[model samples]
Target: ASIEQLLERQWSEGQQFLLEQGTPSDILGMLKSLHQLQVENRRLEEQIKNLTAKKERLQLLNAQLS
Candidate 1:
C-alpha cells in the first residue's frame, strides 16, 4: 500500500500548508464540496450517455423515414 501511504502523506502536507496559511474555512467543508462535485460529475456523465443514445435512436428513425 505504498501508493496509499504516499497519497495520504501528500494530502496531510497539503492540509498542514492550508491550515498554516490561515484558511478561514473548514477543510471538512471543502472536502464535502469536492464530494458533491464528484456526484454531479457522475450525474452529468450519465446524462451525456442518455442523450447520445437518444440522438442515435432518433437518427435511425429519421433514416428509416427517409
Candidate 2:
C-alpha cells in the first residue's frame, strides 16, 4: 500500500507546491510538527489567534523569564 500512500502524498505535495507556495521539502518539515499535532496546521494557528487578539501584546512572556 506504499504505492497508494506514496502516490497520495506526492499528489498532495505537488498540489500544495502550486497552491501554497511552499516546497515539498519545506512542507516535509511542517509535516513533523503538524504530524505530531494531528497532521494539521491549524492547531498552531489556534494558538496564533491569541496573539492577533492585539492586547496579546499585553501578555506573552511578560513573566519572570527575565
Candidate 3:
C-alpha cells in the first residue's frame, strides 16, 4: 500500500489505542510515545516504498523481455 494508506491505517489504530488508555494525566509520556511511534512508522513506510519500487522495476524488466 502507499504511504497515505499506511498512515491512515496507523492513525485509526493509534486513535483506538488512545481511547483505550483513557484520559492522560501527564501529556509528556503520551507525547513521547506518539513521537516514537511516528518515527517508527516513517521508517517502515520508507521500507515499504523501496520494496514496492523494486517490485515494479522487476516487473517492467520481465515484461520487456517477454
Per-candidate TM-scores read 0.58, 0.29, 0.57
lDDT of 1 at 40: 78
RMSD of 3: 6.5
Top model number, TM-score? 1
Clashes of each: 0, 0, 0
Candidate 2, 1-66: lDDT as tens digits: 666477558756765675577457665676656545653454577677976876665556565353
The candidate 3 region of ten consecutive residues with least summed lDDT is: 23-32
Worst 10 residues of 2 by lDDT: 34-43
Worst 10 residues of 1 by lDDT: 3-12
Query: What's the true lDDT of residue 1 in model 3?
Result: 78
Q: What is the lDDT of residue 22 in candidate 2?
A: 49
Ranking by TM-score: 1, 3, 2
- lDDT for model 1: 0.77
In terms of lDDT, which candidate is strongest?
3
lDDT of candidate 3? 0.79
Error of 2 at 51 (Å): 56
